[PDB]
Amino acid sequence: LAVELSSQQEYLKLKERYDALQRTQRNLLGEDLGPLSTKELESLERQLDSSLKQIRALRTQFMLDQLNDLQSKERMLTETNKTLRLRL
């Protein structure tokens, strides 16, 4: 009886912890924003805007690296071609 009751109290506490984290997530996705103040919404906005600047900068850096890698290979393949060109 006491083990059942302790087991239930544990389950309610974890249930409430999880529901709270589910609400936090919904807000990070831009949903269920009803409860939030102007200040809380501004705070999220600043966090999102900061993440987006960082994401964009890295996506561009991956594309510059990719492009740099392709130019390199293009040079190798063009001297390989002119070599075969003369050999034939």
Partner: protein, 91 residues
Amino acid sequence: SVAEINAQYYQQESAKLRQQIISIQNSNRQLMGETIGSMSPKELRNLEGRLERSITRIRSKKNELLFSEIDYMQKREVDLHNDNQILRAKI
């Protein structure tokens, strides 16, 4: 028996919740931009699209709530100015 089977039902469900809690804590960190550094180009594309949607909705909401509270207090002004002219013109 009923108390012992309920007890093991809550302990099973508690274990499930402990998994979902660690799992959602990690997912939230990702949406908060804490793993950007170690993400693939594909993962970045994905997250960019999700965060642009979130920031559009949050910005839009922040504005709607401000407008609504302004709209409310403006009516409350009219309704009180009308309440005061009935009281004056009472006689």
